[PDB]
Amino acid sequence: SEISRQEFQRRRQALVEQMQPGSAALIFAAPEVTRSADSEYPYRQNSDFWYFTGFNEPEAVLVLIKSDDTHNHSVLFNRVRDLTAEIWFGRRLGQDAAPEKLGVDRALAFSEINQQLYQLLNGLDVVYHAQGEYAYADVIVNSALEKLRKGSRQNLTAPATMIDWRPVVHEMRLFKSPEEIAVLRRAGEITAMAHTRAMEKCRPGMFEYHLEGEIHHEFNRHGARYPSYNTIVGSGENGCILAYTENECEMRDGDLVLIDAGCEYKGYAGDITRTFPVNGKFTQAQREIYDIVLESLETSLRLYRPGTSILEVTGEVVRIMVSGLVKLGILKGDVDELIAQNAHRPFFMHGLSHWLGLDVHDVGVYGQDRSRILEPGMVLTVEPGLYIAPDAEVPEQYRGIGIRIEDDIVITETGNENLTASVVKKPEEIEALMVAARKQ
Amino acid sequence: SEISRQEFQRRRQALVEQMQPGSAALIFAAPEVTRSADSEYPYRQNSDFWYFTGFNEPEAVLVLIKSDDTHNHSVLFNRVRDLTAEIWFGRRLGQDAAPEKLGVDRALAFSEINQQLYQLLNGLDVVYHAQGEYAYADVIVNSALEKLRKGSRQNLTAPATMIDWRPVVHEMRLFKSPEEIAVLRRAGEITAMAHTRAMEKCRPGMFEYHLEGEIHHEFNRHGARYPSYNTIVGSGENGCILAYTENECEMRDGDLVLIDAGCEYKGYAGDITRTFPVNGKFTQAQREIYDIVLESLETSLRLYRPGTSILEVTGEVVRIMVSGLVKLGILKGDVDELIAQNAHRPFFMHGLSHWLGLDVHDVGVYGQDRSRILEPGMVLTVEPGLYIAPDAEVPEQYRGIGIRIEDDIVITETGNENLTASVVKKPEEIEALMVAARKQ
Amino acid sequence: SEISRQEFQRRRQALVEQMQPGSAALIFAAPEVTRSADSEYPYRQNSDFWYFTGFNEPEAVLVLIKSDDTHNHSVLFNRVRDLTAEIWFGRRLGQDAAPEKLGVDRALAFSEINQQLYQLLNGLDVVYHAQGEYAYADVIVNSALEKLRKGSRQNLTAPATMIDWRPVVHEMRLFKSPEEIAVLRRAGEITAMAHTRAMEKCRPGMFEYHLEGEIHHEFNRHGARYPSYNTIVGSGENGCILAYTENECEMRDGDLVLIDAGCEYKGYAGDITRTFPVNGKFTQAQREIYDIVLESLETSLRLYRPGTSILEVTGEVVRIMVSGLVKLGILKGDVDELIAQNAHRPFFMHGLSHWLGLDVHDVGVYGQDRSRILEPGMVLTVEPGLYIAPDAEVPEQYRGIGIRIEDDIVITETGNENLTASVVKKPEEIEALMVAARKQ
Amino acid sequence: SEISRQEFQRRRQALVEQMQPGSAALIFAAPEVTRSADSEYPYRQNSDFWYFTGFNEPEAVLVLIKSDDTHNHSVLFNRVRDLTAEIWFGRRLGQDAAPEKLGVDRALAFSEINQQLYQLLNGLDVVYHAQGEYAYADVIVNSALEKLRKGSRQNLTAPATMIDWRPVVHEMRLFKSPEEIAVLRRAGEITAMAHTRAMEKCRPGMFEYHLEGEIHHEFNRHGARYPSYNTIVGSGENGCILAYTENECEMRDGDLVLIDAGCEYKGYAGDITRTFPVNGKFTQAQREIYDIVLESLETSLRLYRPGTSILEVTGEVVRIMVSGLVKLGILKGDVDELIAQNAHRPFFMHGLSHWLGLDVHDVGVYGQDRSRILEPGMVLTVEPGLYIAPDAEVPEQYRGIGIRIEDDIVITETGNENLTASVVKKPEEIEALMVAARKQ
Ligand SMILES: [Cl-]
Ligand SMILES: [Cl-]
Ligand SMILES: [Cl-]
Ligand SMILES: [Cl-]
Ligand SMILES: [Mn+2]
Ligand SMILES: [Mn+2]
Ligand SMILES: [Mn+2]
Ligand SMILES: [Mn+2]
Ligand SMILES: [Mn+2]
Ligand SMILES: [Mn+2]
Ligand SMILES: [Mn+2]
Ligand SMILES: [Mn+2]
C-alpha cells in the first residue's frame, strides 16, 4: 500500500479550496543534515512537504497559487539536472520530468528561486507560510517580500497578510484517508513482526542493542528502511527510563526488557511497545505489575470510539492503576482519595495516547488536557505503563520494574481497529511464544 | 579494542604541550539534530570533541587551560543531573562523577557557561577556538570575549589572539596510536564480515536495500550500532553513481552490484567496497573490467609504504587503467599520449585514496594533488574503480558497468597492513564463495 | 502648533477601528544608533511609533488590543524608572506616569516584554506587525509566537494570521489633519526664514558649509532643533549633484548656489530648495535656465488641485522644459518629437513631487508613475530643476549650471495652499533681497 | 592644522612594523546609519579606519599585507566610479585616483571584495581583524576564511591565527603626534570660542536649546561642522543630570546653566564644560559650591604631569571636595574618616579624567582604577563636578545645584598644556564677561 500521485494532487486541491482568492501557499523541503564533517544523515523529507508531494529531495519548494476562486496552479522549484552532481550523489528529477511525475503545472530550478519567487507573489493579497519552520525558508520568503515592498517604482506590491498554514494542514493530517489507513495498517503489521522476532530471539546474555538489530533487520526486509524514531530497548532498571536509547547493557536472566520500536513505511510511523521477561518467564512480582498495565490497555481498547476522548479513557485507566497499586501495597489509602490526589503519577507519568501518522508524535489539536472528542479517521496510540524506580518506597520485590504495552489504533464509525494486535501481549501468550522459540 | 580514559588524557596533554603559555583551548560537543518534528537523529558526537573525551553527550564543552609552561588544568561544562530529564531521556553523567570518569580536573554545569567561561578566559593571551564549526559555540565564545573586552572597569581583559586548533588537532588525528590501529583493525574485520555476508545472501530478485539490511545487522551484532556513512548498494547502471544511496531497485540476474559500506566502531570508520555478480558468475565483459580494477588495487597494495605518496601510486594505477582500456577498445591510441591527456578520467573520476579514522573522509593535510610523503601510522583507503556509463561511446558490452574495489590499510615501517583482506576480492574466490552459498 | 495627547489617542482609535476583532497591533520604537564608539547620534523616534504616541524614548512598544468589536485597550512597554540611569542619561517617563501622560490604559516595564507579550497575544486570531522593520522587534515578536505555538500543553495558542499594518498606517499618514497641516505650515515658515537668511548672508569667499550653519541656527531659534534631512549647499558644478552634502567648497563670485534644506518641527519636515547667485546678480545664461525652472514651478502651483495627479502636472512641466531648452539651443528638434523621446531626461532626471510629512520622502501609495488622483489633505513638494553637466554637449555658457526651486504645498478643496512662498523665488526679488543685504 | 597623507602613511607603516611576517591587517569603514526611513544620519567614519586613511567614504576596507620582514604593501577596497550614483549622492574617489590620493599601492572595487579578499589572505599565517566591531565586516572576513579552509583541492590555505589589532592601534592612538596635538589645540580653541559665545548670549527666558544653537553655529563658522558628542545644556535641576541632552527648558533667572559641548575638528574632539549663572551673577550658595569645583580643577591642572596618574590626582580632588563640603555642612564628620568612606560619592559620582582624541571618550588602557602612569603625548580631560540633588538631605540653599568645570590638557615633558583656558572659569571673570555682554 502506498500514497499515489493523484492523492498528493487531491491534498493540494483541498488546501487550495481553503485558501483565500489572490493568495499563494509556500511549502519548503527539509534541509540536508550533517552527521559528521562531510557526511550527512540519511535524508528525511519534511512531513508537510511530503504530504503534498511524495517528493524526497532537498532544495525544493512547492508554490500553490490561487489567482481567484476558479483559477489556480502549482509551481515546483527543485534541483536542476546536472551530470556531474548526479554521477556523484544520485539522480535528480529535474524540471522537464517533474510536471508529469508529480502532477504539478510548472517546474523551475531552485537556483532561480530568488529571481522568480517575488514575481509569483507580486500583487497577491495573502501568502501562506510556516514562519520559523526553517531558517533557509524564512530567508527566501523575507527576501522576496522585501523586494516587493521596496519595488513600487517597478510596480511591485507585497501581500500584506501572512497566514501560517500549519493549523489548516495539521487538521488535514489528523484525519486519515482510507489509503493512509492502509499504509498505517502495513506499518503496524511490519512493526508487529519485528516485535515478535525480538521476543523469539531474546536470550539472557544478549545485549539490548542486539534486539535493536533484529528489529531493524525485520523492518528492512519488508521495505521499511528506517525506524520512525530511535529504538528503545530498556532491560531491568533501564525500563524505568521512558525513551532510553543507549541500549548498551547485557540483558540479565530475571529482568524484563521493554522494547519501544516502530518502522517508517512510506513516510508513516508504526509505534509498538512490548515488555517481556528476558528469560521467557515472568516472576510473580513482574506479573502483578504487568497485569495492571495489560488491564489498562485492554480496557482502553474496549472504550476507544467516536464520541469519547483521550481524557475520558485516561480517567478509567487511572482508576485501574490506583486500584491495582493499592491491592499490591504500592499505594496505601482510599482509592477515590488517591485518584483525587493523582497518586498514580510517580508510577505513570506520561500520557495514555498520542496521534500517529507521518510523525510518530503526530500533528493535530488535542484540546485542553487531551479532551477533544474523537471522530472516525483519527489514528492514535494506546500506551499505559507503570515504572517503579529502583529506590521507590514500595515493597522491595517491585523496585526496578518498568512496563509499557502499546498498540496503534484507528477510530472507526463503530469503535476502533487495532493495527498492532498481531504481536502477542497476554502474559501466557508471551510465555508460550518464548518457550517455543527457546526450544529451537 | 577501545580507547581508554588514559589515552584521552594523553591526547589532552599532547595538545597542551603545543599550546602557548597563558592560553585556553575550547572544544565543543556536537548539537543534537532534528530528524522530523520533535524526533531527533541518533546522536553523533563531534569527532574532535570525542577524540579528547570519549564523552557522548551534547551540551558539553572541554576547556584546557595552560596557565604557564608547567601548570595546566582542565574544566568540563556538561549537563547537570536532573531527575525528570533523566527519567524521560536518559541518564546524564553530571558534575560530581565527571572528574573521575573522564579524568578532568573540574566539572561545571553547562547552564552556567555564560557566567563562568569569561572568568576562565580573563587575562589569558591566547584562546584556541574552531571558529565557524558550530553557531552555538561561536555565540558562546563571542559573548565571553565581548564581556571581557567591555569589562575594563571590572579589571577584565580579553585574549587578543585566537588560534584555530583544527590544523594542530587534525595533524594529531592523522597519525594513529597502536590502540587506534587496534580499533580500526576491528572495524575492518567487522566491515569485512558484513561484506562477506552480503555476497553470501545476494540473489536475483532481492532489492538493493535487502543487502543494506544484511550489512547493518552484521555491524550490529559485533557492537558497531551505526554505519560510518550511508551504505551504497548500486546494482546495474546504479553502480555508475558513486555515492548511490537510494538502494531502491530490484537486483537483476546478469547485473553486477557494487556495495560500499562501513561500520562505525568505537567512533572509528571501516570503509570497504566490493563489486560482484548478482547471480554469482561474472560475464566475460564484467570480468574484463573487473580484472583492470583488481590489478590496480593489487599493485597499489604492493606499493604503499613510507616514502611514497598517494599521487605517486595513482600514477601507476592510471597506467594500468589506460593500458587495460586500450586493450579492450574502450580507449584508442598510444598509451603514453592517452596518459598525458588524462584519457582515463571519463571512467575513473575520483581519487585513489583518502585518509580514514574518526571520519570516513578523515582529517589531515594531503599536500598538493595528494603528494604528501607517507609515514607510519597513517591510515588510508585504496579504492580504484571504473564506471562505463550506459550511453558511453564504447563497445556495447561494457556499457552500464560500474566496478569499485576498496581496502583499508595502515602504513607501517615495512610497508602497509591491509585491514580488510578477510573479505575476498579475486574473481574466482568471489565466484566460489557465491557458488557455495547458492547451493545451501 | 503641535500634536496633542488627544490626537495621538484618536489615531490609535482609528487604527483599532480598522483592525479585526480578536487582534493586537504591535508598534515598536526606533533603536538608539551609534555614531562612534560609545557616543550615539541624537535620538530620532520611528515615524509610525511617533504618529501613535508622541513619545520620544527607545525601548518602547505600543500594543493595541482589540478583544472584540466594542472592547479594546492599549498597553505600553517602556523603560522603568531607575535613579542611576536617570542621573547619568536623562529622565524616563516610567510606568506610573505613562497612562495619564500618553493616554494609554496600562504601562509595563520593557525589561518584562518577553515574559508578558506572549500573554497578550495568547488566543488572538490576528497580530499586526511590521515584519522586517527592526531586527530587535522581529526577535521579540517571533519569540512570543514561538512560545505560543509550542505551548499547547499550557493551553496557549498563537494567532495564525500576521498582517503588515504599514499599508493601513501609511494611508492614514498620507491624509493630514488640520492640526498636522498647522504644524507643517509652521515648519514651512521656519524653513523659509532660514532660506531667506542664507540669501541675505551669502557672499563670495564664504564656504558652502557656512550657509548650512546659518540655516541650522535659524531652525534652532524657532524650536526646530534638527534638520529633516542632511542640508545640501551646492555651489557651481556641485549644484549638478542632486543630494550633494559635502558642502566643503569656497563659493565663487559668478557661480550659483543651490540650497536644499528643511527643518524638523514637532516631527514634521519642511523641504525647500532655492538657487541664487553667490554674488547677488544672475548672469544672462543663469537667468535663461532659471526662468525655465521658475515657469515650471509657477505653472505647477497653478495646476495642483484635487482631481489631477503628479503624473499629469509633470507632463505640463516636461513641455515647458523641452520648449525652453529648444529655444536656447540646448535641445535641437521638434518639441513634440523631443517630448516623445523624453529628451529632457539628461537635464531633469528626478520626479517633480514627493509626499511630505513625518518623513521628508513621506509614506503613501503614489500609483503607477505617480498617477494617483490628488485629494484634499495630501501634502507634497513641487521641485522642478535643470542640471547642465560641466561636460554637456551644449552651448558652453550653460555648462555647470544646476538649478532647483522647490515649494511645499497642501491640496485643499479649492486647489492648493503654498506653505513656503514666504521665501522669494522670482529672480528680480532674489536680486533685490541680496542687493539690500549686501549694502549693509 | 590637519593630518596629511604622509602621516596616515607613517601610521600604516608603524602598524606594519608591529605585525608578524606573513600577515594581513584588515580595517573596515563604518556603515551608513539610517535616521528615518530612507534618510541617513551625516556620515561618521570609524575612528580607527580614519586614523589610517583620512578617507570619509563607507564601503571601504584597508588591507595591509606584510609578506615578510622587508616587503609589504597596501590594498584599498572602495566604491567604484559610477556616473548615476554620483549625480545623485555625491562624488566617489574610485580606484584610479585612490593610490595617489591616499598613498596606497593598489585599489580595487568594493563590489569585488568577496572575489578578491580570500586571494590576499591565502597562505598567510596571521590575520589581524577587529572581530565583533561590525557585522558586515565579520561576514566578509568569515566568508573569506571559510573559502580558504574548504579550498585545499584548489591549493588554498587559511591563516590559523586571528589577532585583534585594537589593543595595538589603541595604544598608538593614546600617544599623539605633534600634528595631532596641533589639531586638538585648534579643536580646543574653537570649542572655547563657542563656550564664550554661550556665556555672552545667555539671558533668562531663553531656552536651553538656544545656547546649543549658538554653540553649533560657532563650531561651524570655524570649520568644525559637527559636534563630537551631543551637546548638554542643563539649567537648574537639569544640571544634576550628567549627560542631559533634552535641552528643552526655559532658563530661569536665579538658576545656573551647565554646558558640556565640544566640536569635532578634522576628526578630533574638543570637550569643555562651563557652568555659569543664567542672570550673570552667582548667588552665595552657588558660589560656595562653584569655589570647591574650581579649586579641584585648578589643583588638578597644577599637578598633572608625567609620572603621576589620574588615580593619584583624583585623591587630591576628593580631599578638596570632602573638606569643602564639611565646611558648608553638606557632609558632617571627620574629613579623613569621610574620605575613607568615599562620602563624596553622592555628589561627585563620575571620574575626574578621560582620554581625548578621535573619540571624546578616547581609546587606550587606563590601568586598574585609572592608575596608569602618565607620559608625554597623552591627552585627557579634567572635569570635577558637584551635583546636589533637589531632594538631598543637605542645607536647603544647596539643593538642585549642578556644577562641572572641564578643561582639555596634553601631558608634556614639563607638566601639561591646557588647550581650553581661553574660555574663562574664575567666577569673577565669568561675572565680568556676562556683565559686559548684558550691557550691550
Ligand atoms: Cl538548481
Ligand atoms: Cl546544565
Ligand atoms: Cl525596563
Ligand atoms: Cl563598488
Ligand atoms: Mn507512542
Ligand atoms: Mn512508543
Ligand atoms: Mn572510501
Ligand atoms: Mn568506500
Ligand atoms: Mn523635496
Ligand atoms: Mn528638497
Ligand atoms: Mn569629558
Ligand atoms: Mn565634557
Q: What's A207's domain CATH number?
A: 3.90.230.10
Give the C-alpha separation, B286 to B291, whole Å.
Answer: 9
Give the C-alpha separation, D215 to D217, whole Å.
Answer: 5
Give the C-alpha separation, D234 to D385, whole Å.
Answer: 13
Tell me which chain A residues have a C-beta less than 8 angstroms from the C-beta of B390.
Answer: none
- SS3 for D402? strand
Give the C-alpha separation, C238 to A134, whole Å.
Answer: 49
Judging by DSSP bridges, how do beta strands C34-36 and D126-128 pair with one another? unpaired
Q: Which residues on neighbouring strands pair with residue B250, listed in sequence order?
A: B207
Residues with CB under 5 A from ligand 11 (ion): D 271, 381, 383
Give the C-alpha separation, A361 to A229, whole Å.
Answer: 10
Residues at the binding site of A for Mn(2+) are 260, 271, 354, 383, 406
**What is the grid cell recorded at A389?**
524506580
Beta strands in B50-118 (DSSP E): 61-66, 72-78, 106-109
Q: Which of D2, D28, D35 to mutate to test the interface with C (most CBs of C within 10 A)?
A: D35
If asked whether residues D168 and D257 sit together in one domain, one would say no
Between C132, C149, C161, which is nearest A142 by CB? C132
Contact status, residue C228 vs residue C273, Cβ threshold 8 Å: no
Question: For residue A29, what is the DSSP state?
Answer: P
Cα angle C318-C323-C327, degrees, rounded to a multiple of 5: 145
If asked whether residues A151 and A65 sit together in one domain, one would say yes
If asked whether residues B197 and B281 sit together in one domain, one would say yes
Our CA-based measurement puts residue A329 at a distance from the nearest CA of chain B, in whole angstroms, of: 23
Write out the DSSP string of A166-234: HHHHHHHHHS--HHHHHHHHHHHHHHHHHHHHHHHH--TT-BHHHHHHHHHHHHHHTT--EESS--EEE
Helix pair A5-18, A166-174: axis angle to 10 deg: 130
- Ligand 12 centre distance from Cα of residue D350 (Å): 11
CA atoms within 13 A of residue C26's CA, in its CB half-sphere: 27
Which chains have at least 3 CB atom pairs separated by less than 8 Å from chain D?
Answer: B, C
If asked whether residues B323 and B365 sit together in one domain, one would say yes
- Ligand 5 centre distance from Cα of residue D246 (Å): 63
- Give the CA distances from residue D405 to residues A286, C323, D361, in Å, rounded to whole numbers and listed in that order: 86, 65, 17
D71 is in an annotated binding site: no
- Ligand 1 centre distance from Cα of residue A25 (Å): 21
Give the C-alpha separation, A389 to A391, whole Å.
Answer: 5
Q: Which of C23, C145, C157, C164 to mutate to test the interface with A (most CBs of A within 10 A)?
A: C164
Q: How many residues does chain D have?
A: 440
Give the C-alpha separation, D437 to B222, whole Å.
Answer: 99
C38 is in an annotated binding site: no
The residues, ordered by sequence, that sit 6+ positions from D106 with a Cβ below 8 Å of its Cβ are D73, D74, D75, D76, D99
If asked whether residues B12 and B109 sit together in one domain, one would say yes
Between B131, B152, B161, which is nearest D163 by CB? B161
Helix pair A310-328, A284-303: axis angle to 10 deg: 160
Beta strands in D80-236 (DSSP E): 106-109, 126-128, 161-163, 226-227, 232-235
With CA atoms as reference, report the closest residue to A387 among A268, A200, A232, A251: A232
The residues, ordered by sequence, that sit 6+ positions from B240 with a Cβ below 8 Å of its Cβ are A87, B234, B387, B388, B389, B390, B400, B401, B402
Give the C-alpha separation, D58 to B247, whole Å.
Answer: 54
Contact status, residue D110 vs residue D77, Cβ threshold 8 Å: yes
Q: Which residue has the cell 522593520?
A: C133
Tell me which chain D residues have a C-beta less than 8 angstroms from the C-beta of B366.
Answer: 152
- Give the CA distances from residue B184 to residues B12, B267, B418, C333, in Å, rounded to whole numbers and listed in that order: 21, 9, 11, 87
C271 is in an annotated binding site: yes
Helix pair B284-303, B427-438: axis angle to 10 deg: 120
* Determination approach: X-ray
Listed as own residue / partner, the contacts of B101-104 with beta carbons closer than 8 Å and 24 or more positions apart are B101/B5, B102/B5, B102/B8, B102/B53, B102/B54, B102/B55, B102/B76, B103/B5, B103/B6, B103/B8, B103/B9, B104/B62, B104/B74, B104/B75, B104/B76
Strand order in the sheet with A61-66: A106-109, A72-78, A61-66, A23-28, A126-128, A161-163, C161-163, C126-128, C23-28, C61-66, C72-78, C106-109
Between D146, D166, D365, which is nearest B132 by CB? D146
Give the C-alpha separation, B61 to B77, whole Å.
Answer: 5
With CA atoms as reference, report the closest residue to A121 among A26, A19, A24: A24
- Give the CA distances from residue B70 to residues B73, B140, C286, in Å, rounded to whole numbers and listed in that order: 10, 28, 83
Which of these three, A146, A173, A200, is where a domain ends? A173
- Give the CA distances from residue C153 to residues A362, A367, A368, C420, D54, in Å, rounded to whole numbers and listed in that order: 15, 9, 7, 62, 60
What residue of B is the nearest CA neighbor of D146?
B132
Q: What is the dihedral of CA C247, C251, C255, C256, to 10 degrees?
A: 50
Tell me which chain B residues have a C-beta less than 8 angstroms from the C-beta of A358.
Answer: 36
If asked whether residues B122 and B192 sit together in one domain, one would say no
If asked whether residues C391 and C261 sit together in one domain, one would say yes
Radius of gyration for chain B, computed over Cα atoms and rounded to the nearest angstrom: 25
Write out the DSSP string of C182-234: HHHHHHHHHHHHHHHHHHHH--TT-BHHHHHHHHHHHHHHTT--EESS--EEE
If asked whether residues A211 and A323 sit together in one domain, one would say yes
Judging by DSSP bridges, how do beta strands B126-128 and B23-28 pair with one another? parallel
The residues, ordered by sequence, that sit 6+ positions from A334 with a Cβ below 8 Å of its Cβ are none
If asked whether residues C115 and C180 sit together in one domain, one would say no
Give the C-alpha separation, C212 to C204, whole Å.
Answer: 15
Contact status, residue C220 vs residue D213, Cβ threshold 8 Å: yes
With CA atoms as reference, report the closest residue to C13 among C2, C25, C28, C1: C25
Give A284: exposed, middle or buried? Use CB within 10 Å, 0-12, 13-18, 19+: exposed
If asked whether residues B82 and B197 sit together in one domain, one would say no
- Give the CA distances from residue D209 to residues C45, C387, D250, D402, in Å, rounded to whole numbers and listed in that order: 19, 38, 9, 18
Between D155, D158, D162, which is nearest B162 by CB? D162
Contact status, residue A183 vs residue B175, Cβ threshold 8 Å: no
Which of these three, C173, C195, C215, is where a domain ends? C173
Between A220, A241, A245, which is nearest B87 by CB? A241
Give the C-alpha separation, B85 to B109, whole Å.
Answer: 15
Contact status, residue A407 vs residue A302, Cβ threshold 8 Å: no
Our CA-based measurement puts residue A155 at a distance from the nearest CA of chain C, in whole angstroms, of: 6
For residue C228, the tally of other CB atoms under 10 A from its CB is: 27
Give A307: exposed, middle or buried? Use CB within 10 Å, 0-12, 13-18, 19+: exposed
Contact status, residue C270 vs residue C402, Cβ threshold 8 Å: no
Give the C-alpha separation, D267 to D173, whole Å.
Answer: 13
Contact status, residue A302 vs residue A382, Cβ threshold 8 Å: no
**What is the grid cell recorded at A331?**
499505594
Question: For residue B236, what is the DSSP state?
Answer: G
The residues, ordered by sequence, that sit 6+ positions from D363 with a Cβ below 8 Å of its Cβ are C37, D47, D166, D169, D170, D173, D174, D355, D357
If asked whether residues B362 and B409 sit together in one domain, one would say yes
- Ligand 8 centre distance from Cα of residue B230 (Å): 10
Give the C-alpha separation, D163 to B236, whole Å.
Answer: 55
Give the C-alpha separation, D307 to C48, whole Å.
Answer: 55
- Ligand 1 centre distance from Cα of residue A110 (Å): 4
Which chains have at least 3 CB atom pairs separated by less than 8 Å from chain B?
Answer: A, D
Query: Residue C343: which region, alpha, beta or left (left: phi > 0; alpha: psi -120 to 50)?
Result: alpha
- b (16+ CB within 10 A) / e for D313-349: bbebbbbbbbbbbbebebbeeebeebbeeebbebbbe
CB contact under 8 A, A41 and B34: no
Which chains have at least 3 CB atom pairs separated by less than 8 Å from chain A?
Answer: B, C
Give the C-alpha separation, D281 to D188, whole Å.
Answer: 26
Contact status, residue A24 vs residue A127, Cβ threshold 8 Å: yes
Question: For residue B190, what is the DSSP state?
Answer: H
> What is the domain range of residue D25?
1-173
Our CA-based measurement puts residue B200 at a distance from the nearest CA of chain A, in whole angstroms, of: 16
CB contact under 8 A, A162 and C158: no
In this structure, which amino acid lies at residue C242? L
Cα angle A372-A373-A375, degrees, rounded to a multiple of 5: 125
If asked whether residues C187 and C206 sit together in one domain, one would say yes
Give the C-alpha separation, A215 to A201, whole Å.
Answer: 10
The residues, ordered by sequence, that sit 6+ positions from B155 with a Cβ below 8 Å of its Cβ are D368
Give the C-alpha separation, A152 to A138, whole Å.
Answer: 22
Give the C-alpha separation, B145 to D162, whole Å.
Answer: 14
Judging by DSSP bridges, how do beta strands A415-418 and A407-412 pair with one another? antiparallel
For chain C, which residues lie within 8 Å of any Cβ of chain A, measuring from their own Cβ?
131-132, 142, 145-146, 149, 152, 155, 158, 160-164, 166-167, 365-366, 368
**What is the grid cell recorded at C198?**
542664507
Strand order in the sheet with C232-235: C232-235, C256-261, C272-277
Give A435: exposed, middle or buried? Use CB within 10 Å, 0-12, 13-18, 19+: exposed
Which of these three, A173, A191, A207, is where a domain ends? A173
With CA atoms as reference, report the closest residue to B363 among B98, B176, B192: B176
Give the C-alpha separation, C262 to C216, whole Å.
Answer: 9
With CA atoms as reference, report the closest residue to B256 among B208, B327, B197, B321: B208
Residues with CB under 5 A from ligand 9 (ion): C 271, 381, 383
Give the C-alpha separation, C278 to C259, whole Å.
Answer: 11
Tell me which chain C residues have a C-beta less than 8 angstroms from the C-beta of D89.
Answer: 241-243
Question: For residue A350, what is the DSSP state?
Answer: S
Contact status, residue A76 vs residue A102, Cβ threshold 8 Å: yes
Contact status, residue D305 vs residue D313, Cβ threshold 8 Å: no
For residue D384, the tally of other CB atoms under 10 A from its CB is: 28
For residue A178, the tally of other CB atoms under 10 A from its CB is: 8
- SS3 for B311? helix
Tell me which chain A residues have a C-beta less than 8 angstroms from the C-beta of B216.
Answer: 213, 216-217, 220
Give the C-alpha separation, B17 to B14, whole Å.
Answer: 5
Q: φ, ψ for residue C160 (rounded to 5)?
A: -80, -20
- SS3 for D379? strand
- What is the torsional sign of CA A52, A55, A56, A61? negative
Our CA-based measurement puts residue D280 at a distance from the nearest CA of chain C, in whole angstroms, of: 21
What residue of B is the nearest CA neighbor of D166?
B160
With CA atoms as reference, report the closest residue to C120 among C63, C163, C59, C53: C63
Tell me which chain B residues have a C-beta less than 8 angstroms from the C-beta of D163.
Answer: 160-162
In this structure, which amino acid lies at residue B398? Y
Residues at the binding site of B for Mn(2+) are 260, 271, 354, 383, 406
Total tally of structural domains belonging to chain D: 2
Query: Residue D75: which region, alpha, beta or left (left: phi > 0; alpha: psi -120 to 50)?
Result: beta
Measured in Å, how far apart are chain C's first and last C-alpha atoms? Answer: 34
Q: Which residue has the cell 580646543?
A: D188
- Ligand 5 centre distance from Cα of residue B152 (Å): 54
Give the count of Cβ contacts less than 8 A between chain A and C: 42
Indicate which CATH number applies to the domain containing D31.
3.40.350.10
Contact status, residue B148 vs residue D167, Cβ threshold 8 Å: no
For residue D261, the ligand closest to its alpha carbon is 12
- What is the torsional sign of CA C44, C50, C56, C59? negative
For chain B, which residues lie within 8 Å of any Cβ of chain D, measuring from their own Cβ?
131-132, 142, 145-146, 149, 152, 155, 158, 160-164, 166-167, 365-366, 368
Q: Which residues on neighbouring strands pair with residue C326, listed in sequence order?
A: none
